[PDB]
Amino acid sequence: PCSLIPAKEAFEREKKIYGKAILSFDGVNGYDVYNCSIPFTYDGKTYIFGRVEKKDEWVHSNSILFEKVGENRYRRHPASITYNLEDPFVVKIHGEMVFGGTHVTKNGGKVSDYRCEFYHGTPFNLKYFSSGPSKMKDIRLVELADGKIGIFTHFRTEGSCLTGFTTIDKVEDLTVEVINSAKLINHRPFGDAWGGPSQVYLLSSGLLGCISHHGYLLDIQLRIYACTSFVFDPATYEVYNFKIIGTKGCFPPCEPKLPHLADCAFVSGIEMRNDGKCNLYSGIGDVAEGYIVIDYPFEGYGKIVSDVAF
Amino acid sequence: SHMGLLNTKPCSLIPAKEAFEREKKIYGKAILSFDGVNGYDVYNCSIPFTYDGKTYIFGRVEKKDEWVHSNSILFEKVGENRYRRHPASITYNLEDPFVVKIHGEMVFGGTHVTKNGGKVSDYRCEFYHGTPFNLKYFSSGPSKMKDIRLVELADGKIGIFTHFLTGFTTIDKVEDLTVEVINSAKLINHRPFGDAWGGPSQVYLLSSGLLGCISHHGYLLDQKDGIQLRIYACTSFVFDPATYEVYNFKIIGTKGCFPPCEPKLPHLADCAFVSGIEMRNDGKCNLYSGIGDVAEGYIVIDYPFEGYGKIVSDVAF
Ligand code: NA
Ligand code: NA
């Protein structure tokens, strides 16, 4: 029985949620928008990347830049190009944006391959520079306290579900060879959950705070995808403080894309508030993006010192 | 060889290209203007097409001083030879966009490039279908195969041109376009093309049931006390899908026919990468081409399939 199951059942019973909202998106012909990047700032405005897909289409996503135009309200920014990608994500590395998402290959309508594509530059001038290995979805970058680039990898091509970590010096050093050879982290804390980070934060302690998506099957089975967090030490490859920090049921209700996704959240990341709490953004049901207001999940391991102020 | 040690095996196509430069009949020319892409170069366009009362074209968009940083963008016609990015359309992370009509809808394609640490590692054609503002991704061709082009045949089947040597095969519906179908295509009659490299860019159904192909063919031209040119000329041929026979292979355009423009790099000073033809009311055609990997123009030429039937395919969506 999954080790995550007690932690989830417990969390569902004793969470502290201080607020919640579903986001509104304009300028995409009423398409669903989900599995967003975290919000980021550029030249005095707030932006977010969204995965854009018709509610009744599967594997027909594009990643679109949205400008915040009001309280929980976003509109497609027409100046930006779009990206033929699923599950867009951003991070700041060496003073610039690194943007990625999943590029899907089909063979006569059937998915045959997929891999992460990485862009860098400024938010309206992103340049494609590298792809990750075939069938690896869950790659995330962060700038380490000493200026190196940390890379989380997910090995799931062989029936297994293991997380790796490696470093490079400059973002154009990101290769399939570096990714495939990443040293395995201590995954024992995750138990038989599968997933990995959505957003990685540099903490004042020099540890990495990871806001992660983990899935498991609950006994016929149920698919559960939960918002999780853990703290990682790049010096030892140790994992600390693994926990559930949100579930789909914490967000306002919305009908999932199909009933098998009724307990599916795909986390985006956290944004610190003035009050010391944070907004936890998540994709929900593969149909929507929302946030819940939660306690800071890395309390005791340091404050976030990475930023997405471009 | 006529080039002595400069090239021991000059391309078979050189005399045809030189003869065209002496004997061509060009009735007009223009460079297209593009708005809405921050002054980026726009080149290697689709043919123009119509939709919902307006004229459109797909452009390959790239900064003049950047290599392998293209996107394909839908442009709406503003005025004579003037286009602007249509803000409602999504963009495609592709080079060398192309369109055709199949079974009443658009099939759009382009080249998706894969990199490894900044270096090109792979590329393949990606295919979309639907209406022009509602295109859905459905298939990729094989690794490193650039020149795949579709056409609806007289009998309602879908014709597929491949590049290994040019191949041709058929399928019943666009969803059956697979790597396995493309790789198993039979070779067409290559004898007319000699040792020129290239293949079709735009394929048209003719009233005779034959296919009119607007193509790109080229070769390397080594120069005495000069640099090597990558020559690309606009060519055409007529193809019989019943016999795989090729007729009327010829040169129909060269970069020198279009208004002047400084190429992206000096090796592209004689590079025209054809887009396709559009019939005029006067029975001539506009031949659209990318030029120098920096611009898009057209020249006014005689109908290149004259004698083999009228175009009966369309791009009126
Ligand atoms: Na199929
Ligand atoms: Na590199």
Side-chain angles (χ1 to χ4, degrees), chain A residues 69-128:
Chain A
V69 296
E71 178 69 15
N72 299 327
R73 201 155 31 84
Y74 286 89
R75 177 181 48 63
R76 166 168 178 200
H77 196 307
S80 183
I81 70 172
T82 66
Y83 305 91
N84 313 131
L85 299 176
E86 299 177 350
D87 296 351
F89 59 94
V90 302
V91 66
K92 188 152 144 186
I93 306 287
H94 298 156
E96 63 173 1
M97 170 172 284
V98 178
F99 160 88
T102 302
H103 191 82
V104 180
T105 298
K106 291 171 188 180
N107 186 36
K110 295 172 66 165
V111 175
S112 58
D113 205 355
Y114 48 85
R115 62 192 72 193
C116 285
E117 297 194 342
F118 299 93
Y119 288 69
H120 72 133
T122 62
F124 289 82
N125 192 46
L126 288 175
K127 304 297 160 161
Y128 171 69

Coordinates of all heavy atoms in Angstrom, one line a residue, chain A residues 69-128:
Chain A
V69 N -4.5 41.1 -16.1 CA -5.2 42.3 -16.4 C -6.2 42.6 -15.2 O -6.8 43.7 -15.2 CB -5.9 42.2 -17.7 CG1 -4.9 42.1 -18.8 CG2 -6.9 41.1 -17.8
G70 N -6.3 41.8 -14.2 CA -7.2 42.1 -13.1 C -7.1 41.0 -12.0 O -6.2 40.1 -12.1
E71 N -7.8 41.2 -10.9 CA -7.9 40.3 -9.8 C -8.2 38.9 -10.4 O -9.3 38.7 -10.9 CB -8.9 40.9 -8.8 CG -9.1 40.0 -7.5 CD -7.9 39.9 -6.6 OE1 -7.0 40.7 -6.7 OE2 -8.0 39.0 -5.7
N72 N -7.3 37.9 -10.3 CA -7.4 36.5 -10.8 C -7.8 36.5 -12.2 O -8.3 35.4 -12.6 CB -8.4 35.8 -9.9 CG -8.0 35.7 -8.5 OD1 -6.8 35.7 -8.2 ND2 -9.0 35.7 -7.6
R73 N -7.4 37.5 -13.0 CA -7.8 37.6 -14.4 C -6.6 37.8 -15.3 O -5.8 38.7 -15.1 CB -8.8 38.7 -14.6 CG -9.6 38.5 -15.9 CD -11.0 39.2 -15.8 NE -10.9 40.4 -15.0 CZ -10.6 41.6 -15.4 NH1 -10.2 41.8 -16.7 NH2 -10.5 42.6 -14.5
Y74 N -6.4 36.9 -16.3 CA -5.3 36.9 -17.3 C -5.8 36.9 -18.7 O -6.9 36.4 -18.9 CB -4.5 35.6 -17.0 CG -3.7 35.7 -15.8 CD1 -4.2 35.3 -14.5 CD2 -2.4 36.2 -15.8 CE1 -3.4 35.3 -13.4 CE2 -1.6 36.2 -14.7 CZ -2.1 35.8 -13.5 OH -1.3 35.8 -12.4
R75 N -5.1 37.6 -19.6 CA -5.5 37.7 -21.0 C -4.2 37.3 -21.9 O -3.1 37.8 -21.5 CB -6.0 39.1 -21.3 CG -6.4 39.3 -22.7 CD -6.9 40.7 -23.0 NE -6.1 41.7 -22.5 CZ -4.8 42.0 -22.8 NH1 -4.1 41.3 -23.6 NH2 -4.2 43.1 -22.1
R76 N -4.5 36.6 -23.0 CA -3.3 36.2 -23.9 C -2.7 37.6 -24.3 O -3.3 38.5 -24.7 CB -3.9 35.5 -25.1 CG -2.9 35.4 -26.2 CD -3.3 34.4 -27.3 NE -2.2 34.4 -28.3 CZ -2.4 34.0 -29.6 NH1 -3.5 33.4 -30.0 NH2 -1.4 34.1 -30.4
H77 N -1.3 37.6 -24.2 CA -0.6 38.8 -24.7 C -0.3 38.6 -26.2 O 0.5 37.7 -26.5 CB 0.7 39.0 -23.9 CG 1.2 40.3 -24.1 ND1 1.5 40.8 -25.4 CD2 1.5 41.4 -23.3 CE1 1.9 42.0 -25.4 NE2 1.9 42.4 -24.2
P78 N -1.0 39.3 -27.0 CA -0.8 39.1 -28.5 C 0.6 39.3 -29.1 O 0.8 38.8 -30.1 CB -1.8 40.2 -29.1 CG -2.0 41.2 -28.0 CD -1.8 40.5 -26.7
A79 N 1.5 40.1 -28.4 CA 2.8 40.3 -29.0 C 3.7 39.0 -28.9 O 4.6 38.8 -29.8 CB 3.6 41.4 -28.3
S80 N 3.4 38.2 -27.9 CA 4.2 37.0 -27.7 C 4.0 35.9 -28.8 O 2.8 35.8 -29.1 CB 4.0 36.4 -26.3 OG 4.9 35.3 -26.1
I81 N 5.0 35.2 -29.2 CA 4.8 33.9 -29.9 C 4.2 32.9 -28.9 O 4.2 33.2 -27.7 CB 6.1 33.5 -30.6 CG1 7.1 33.0 -29.6 CG2 6.6 34.5 -31.6 CD1 8.3 32.3 -30.3
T82 N 3.7 31.8 -29.5 CA 3.2 30.7 -28.7 C 4.2 29.5 -28.9 O 5.0 29.6 -29.9 CB 1.7 30.3 -29.1 OG1 1.7 29.8 -30.4 CG2 0.8 31.4 -29.0
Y83 N 4.1 28.5 -28.0 CA 5.0 27.4 -28.0 C 4.2 26.1 -28.1 O 3.1 26.0 -27.4 CB 5.9 27.5 -26.8 CG 6.6 28.8 -26.7 CD1 6.1 29.9 -26.0 CD2 7.8 29.0 -27.4 CE1 6.7 31.1 -26.0 CE2 8.5 30.2 -27.3 CZ 7.9 31.3 -26.6 OH 8.6 32.5 -26.6
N84 N 4.6 25.2 -29.1 CA 3.9 24.0 -29.3 C 4.3 23.0 -28.2 O 5.0 22.0 -28.6 CB 4.1 23.5 -30.8 CG 3.9 24.6 -31.8 OD1 4.8 24.8 -32.7 ND2 2.8 25.4 -31.6
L85 N 3.9 23.2 -27.0 CA 4.4 22.5 -25.8 C 3.2 22.3 -24.8 O 2.3 23.2 -24.8 CB 5.5 23.3 -25.1 CG 6.7 23.6 -26.0 CD1 7.7 24.5 -25.2 CD2 7.4 22.3 -26.3
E86 N 3.3 21.3 -24.0 CA 2.5 21.1 -22.8 C 3.3 21.5 -21.5 O 4.5 21.5 -21.5 CB 2.1 19.6 -22.6 CG 1.4 19.0 -23.8 CD 1.1 17.5 -23.7 OE1 1.6 16.9 -22.8 OE2 0.3 17.0 -24.6
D87 N 2.5 21.9 -20.5 CA 3.1 22.0 -19.1 C 4.3 22.9 -19.1 O 5.4 22.6 -18.8 CB 3.5 20.6 -18.6 CG 2.2 19.7 -18.4 OD1 1.1 20.2 -18.6 OD2 2.5 18.5 -18.1
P88 N 4.0 24.2 -19.4 CA 5.1 25.2 -19.5 C 5.6 25.6 -18.1 O 4.9 25.5 -17.1 CB 4.5 26.5 -20.1 CG 3.0 26.3 -19.7 CD 2.7 24.8 -19.7
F89 N 6.9 25.9 -18.0 CA 7.5 26.3 -16.7 C 8.7 27.3 -16.9 O 9.3 27.2 -18.0 CB 8.0 25.0 -16.0 CG 9.0 24.1 -16.7 CD1 10.3 24.3 -16.5 CD2 8.6 23.1 -17.6 CE1 11.3 23.5 -17.2 CE2 9.5 22.4 -18.3 CZ 10.9 22.6 -18.1
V90 N 8.9 28.1 -15.9 CA 9.9 29.2 -16.0 C 10.8 29.1 -14.7 O 10.4 28.6 -13.7 CB 9.3 30.6 -16.1 CG1 8.5 30.6 -17.4 CG2 8.5 31.0 -14.9
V91 N 12.0 29.6 -14.9 CA 13.0 29.8 -13.7 C 13.9 30.9 -14.2 O 14.1 31.1 -15.4 CB 13.7 28.5 -13.3 CG1 14.6 28.0 -14.4 CG2 14.4 28.7 -12.0
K92 N 14.5 31.6 -13.2 CA 15.6 32.6 -13.5 C 16.9 31.9 -13.3 O 17.2 31.3 -12.2 CB 15.4 33.8 -12.6 CG 16.4 34.9 -13.0 CD 15.7 36.2 -12.5 CE 16.6 37.2 -12.0 NZ 15.8 38.4 -11.5
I93 N 17.8 32.0 -14.3 CA 19.2 31.5 -14.3 C 20.1 32.6 -14.8 O 19.9 33.0 -16.0 CB 19.3 30.2 -15.1 CG1 18.3 29.2 -14.7 CG2 20.8 29.7 -15.1 CD1 18.6 28.5 -13.4
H94 N 21.1 33.1 -14.0 CA 22.1 34.0 -14.4 C 21.4 35.3 -15.1 O 21.8 35.8 -16.1 CB 23.1 33.4 -15.4 CG 23.8 32.3 -14.7 ND1 24.4 31.2 -15.5 CD2 24.0 31.9 -13.5 CE1 25.0 30.4 -14.7 NE2 24.8 30.8 -13.4
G95 N 20.3 35.8 -14.4 CA 19.7 37.1 -14.8 C 18.8 37.0 -16.0 O 18.4 38.0 -16.4
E96 N 18.5 35.8 -16.5 CA 17.6 35.7 -17.7 C 16.6 34.6 -17.4 O 16.7 33.8 -16.4 CB 18.3 35.5 -19.0 CG 19.1 34.2 -19.0 CD 19.7 33.9 -20.4 OE1 19.5 34.7 -21.3 OE2 20.4 32.8 -20.5
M97 N 15.6 34.5 -18.3 CA 14.5 33.5 -18.2 C 15.0 32.2 -18.9 O 15.6 32.3 -20.0 CB 13.2 34.0 -18.8 CG 12.1 32.8 -18.9 SD 10.5 33.4 -19.4 CE 9.9 34.1 -17.9
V98 N 14.7 31.1 -18.2 CA 14.8 29.7 -18.8 C 13.3 29.2 -18.8 O 12.7 29.2 -17.8 CB 15.8 28.8 -18.2 CG1 15.8 27.4 -18.8 CG2 17.2 29.4 -18.2
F99 N 12.8 28.9 -20.0 CA 11.4 28.5 -20.2 C 11.5 27.1 -20.8 O 12.4 26.8 -21.6 CB 10.7 29.5 -21.1 CG 9.4 29.0 -21.8 CD1 8.2 29.0 -21.1 CD2 9.5 28.4 -23.1 CE1 7.1 28.5 -21.7 CE2 8.3 27.9 -23.6 CZ 7.1 28.0 -22.9
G100 N 10.7 26.2 -20.4 CA 10.6 24.9 -20.9 C 9.1 24.4 -21.0 O 8.2 25.0 -20.4
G101 N 8.9 23.3 -21.7 CA 7.7 22.6 -21.8 C 7.9 21.3 -22.5 O 9.1 21.0 -22.9
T102 N 6.9 20.5 -22.6 CA 7.0 19.1 -23.3 C 6.6 19.2 -24.7 O 5.5 19.6 -25.0 CB 6.1 18.1 -22.5 OG1 6.5 18.0 -21.2 CG2 6.2 16.7 -23.1
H103 N 7.5 18.8 -25.6 CA 7.1 18.8 -27.1 C 6.8 17.3 -27.4 O 7.6 16.4 -27.1 CB 8.3 19.2 -28.0 CG 7.9 19.4 -29.4 ND1 7.2 20.5 -29.8 CD2 7.9 18.5 -30.4 CE1 6.9 20.4 -31.1 NE2 7.3 19.2 -31.5
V104 N 5.6 17.1 -27.9 CA 5.0 15.8 -28.2 C 5.2 15.5 -29.7 O 4.9 16.3 -30.5 CB 3.5 15.7 -27.8 CG1 3.0 14.4 -28.1 CG2 3.3 16.1 -26.3
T105 N 5.7 14.3 -30.0 CA 5.8 13.7 -31.4 C 4.7 12.7 -31.5 O 4.5 11.8 -30.6 CB 7.2 13.2 -31.7 OG1 8.1 14.3 -31.6 CG2 7.2 12.6 -33.1
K106 N 4.0 12.8 -32.7 CA 3.0 11.8 -33.1 C 3.4 11.1 -34.3 O 4.2 11.6 -35.1 CB 1.6 12.4 -33.2 CG 0.9 12.9 -32.0 CD -0.3 13.8 -32.3 CE -0.9 14.4 -31.0 NZ -2.1 15.2 -31.3
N107 N 2.8 9.9 -34.5 CA 3.0 9.0 -35.7 C 1.6 8.6 -36.1 O 1.0 7.8 -35.5 CB 3.9 7.9 -35.4 CG 4.2 7.1 -36.6 OD1 4.4 7.6 -37.7 ND2 4.4 5.8 -36.5
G108 N 1.0 9.3 -37.1 CA -0.3 9.0 -37.6 C -1.4 9.1 -36.5 O -2.3 8.3 -36.4
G109 N -1.3 10.2 -35.7 CA -2.3 10.6 -34.7 C -2.0 10.0 -33.3 O -2.6 10.5 -32.4
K110 N -1.1 9.0 -33.2 CA -0.7 8.3 -32.0 C 0.6 9.0 -31.4 O 1.5 9.1 -32.2 CB -0.5 6.8 -32.1 CG -1.7 6.0 -32.6 CD -1.3 4.6 -32.9 CE -0.8 3.8 -31.8 NZ -0.9 2.3 -32.1
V111 N 0.6 9.2 -30.1 CA 1.9 9.7 -29.5 C 2.9 8.7 -29.6 O 2.7 7.6 -29.2 CB 1.6 10.1 -28.0 CG1 2.9 10.5 -27.4 CG2 0.6 11.2 -28.0
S112 N 4.1 9.1 -30.1 CA 5.2 8.2 -30.4 C 6.4 8.6 -29.5 O 7.2 7.7 -29.2 CB 5.6 8.1 -31.8 OG 5.9 9.4 -32.3
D113 N 6.5 9.8 -29.1 CA 7.7 10.3 -28.4 C 7.3 11.6 -27.7 O 6.3 12.3 -28.1 CB 8.9 10.4 -29.3 CG 10.3 10.3 -28.6 OD1 10.3 10.2 -27.4 OD2 11.3 10.3 -29.3
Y114 N 8.2 12.0 -26.7 CA 8.0 13.4 -26.2 C 9.3 13.7 -25.5 O 10.0 12.8 -25.1 CB 6.8 13.5 -25.2 CG 6.7 12.4 -24.2 CD1 7.4 12.5 -23.0 CD2 5.9 11.3 -24.4 CE1 7.3 11.5 -22.0 CE2 5.8 10.3 -23.5 CZ 6.5 10.4 -22.3 OH 6.4 9.4 -21.4
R115 N 9.6 15.0 -25.4 CA 10.8 15.4 -24.7 C 10.6 16.9 -24.3 O 9.9 17.7 -24.9 CB 12.0 15.2 -25.5 CG 12.2 15.9 -26.8 CD 13.3 15.3 -27.6 NE 13.0 14.0 -28.1 CZ 13.9 13.1 -28.5 NH1 15.2 13.4 -28.6 NH2 13.5 11.9 -29.0
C116 N 11.4 17.3 -23.3 CA 11.4 18.7 -22.8 C 12.2 19.6 -23.7 O 13.4 19.1 -24.1 CB 12.0 18.8 -21.4 SG 10.9 18.2 -20.1
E117 N 11.7 20.7 -24.1 CA 12.4 21.7 -24.9 C 12.6 22.9 -24.0 O 11.7 23.3 -23.2 CB 11.6 22.1 -26.2 CG 11.4 21.0 -27.1 CD 11.0 21.4 -28.5 OE1 10.5 22.5 -28.6 OE2 11.1 20.5 -29.4
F118 N 13.8 23.5 -24.1 CA 14.3 24.6 -23.2 C 14.6 25.8 -24.1 O 15.3 25.7 -25.2 CB 15.5 24.2 -22.4 CG 15.2 23.1 -21.5 CD1 15.5 21.7 -21.8 CD2 14.6 23.3 -20.2 CE1 15.2 20.7 -21.0 CE2 14.4 22.2 -19.4 CZ 14.7 21.0 -19.7
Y119 N 14.1 26.9 -23.7 CA 14.4 28.3 -24.3 C 15.1 29.2 -23.3 O 14.8 29.0 -22.1 CB 13.1 28.9 -24.7 CG 12.4 28.3 -25.9 CD1 11.8 27.1 -25.9 CD2 12.2 29.0 -27.1 CE1 11.2 26.6 -27.0 CE2 11.6 28.5 -28.2 CZ 11.0 27.3 -28.2 OH 10.4 26.8 -29.3
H120 N 15.9 30.1 -23.7 CA 16.3 31.2 -22.8 C 16.3 32.6 -23.5 O 16.3 32.7 -24.7 CB 17.7 30.8 -22.2 CG 18.8 30.9 -23.2 ND1 20.0 31.6 -22.9 CD2 19.0 30.4 -24.4 CE1 20.9 31.5 -23.9 NE2 20.3 30.7 -24.9
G121 N 16.3 33.6 -22.6 CA 16.3 35.0 -23.0 C 15.4 35.8 -22.1 O 15.3 35.5 -20.9
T122 N 14.8 36.8 -22.7 CA 13.8 37.7 -22.0 C 12.4 37.1 -22.4 O 12.3 36.4 -23.3 CB 14.0 39.1 -22.3 OG1 13.8 39.3 -23.8 CG2 15.3 39.6 -21.9
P123 N 11.4 37.4 -21.6 CA 10.1 36.8 -21.8 C 9.4 36.9 -23.1 O 8.7 36.0 -23.5 CB 9.3 37.4 -20.6 CG 10.3 37.8 -19.6 CD 11.4 38.3 -20.4
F124 N 9.7 38.0 -23.9 CA 9.1 38.3 -25.2 C 10.2 38.0 -26.3 O 10.0 38.3 -27.4 CB 8.5 39.6 -25.4 CG 7.2 39.8 -24.6 CD1 7.2 40.1 -23.3 CD2 6.0 39.6 -25.3 CE1 6.1 40.3 -22.6 CE2 4.8 39.8 -24.6 CZ 4.8 40.2 -23.2
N125 N 11.3 37.4 -25.9 CA 12.4 37.1 -26.8 C 13.2 35.8 -26.4 O 14.4 35.9 -26.0 CB 13.3 38.3 -27.1 CG 14.3 38.2 -28.2 OD1 13.8 37.7 -29.3 ND2 15.5 38.6 -28.1
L126 N 12.4 34.7 -26.3 CA 13.0 33.4 -25.9 C 13.5 32.6 -27.1 O 12.8 32.6 -28.2 CB 11.8 32.6 -25.2 CG 11.4 33.1 -23.8 CD1 10.2 32.3 -23.3 CD2 12.6 33.0 -22.9
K127 N 14.7 32.1 -26.9 CA 15.4 31.3 -27.9 C 15.6 29.9 -27.5 O 16.1 29.6 -26.5 CB 16.8 32.0 -28.2 CG 16.7 33.5 -28.5 CD 16.0 33.8 -29.8 CE 15.5 35.2 -29.9 NZ 15.2 35.8 -31.2
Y128 N 15.2 29.0 -28.4 CA 15.3 27.5 -28.2 C 16.8 27.1 -28.3 O 17.5 27.5 -29.2 CB 14.5 26.7 -29.3 CG 14.8 25.3 -29.2 CD1 14.4 24.5 -28.2 CD2 15.4 24.6 -30.3 CE1 14.7 23.1 -28.1 CE2 15.7 23.3 -30.3 CZ 15.3 22.5 -29.2 OH 15.6 21.2 -29.2

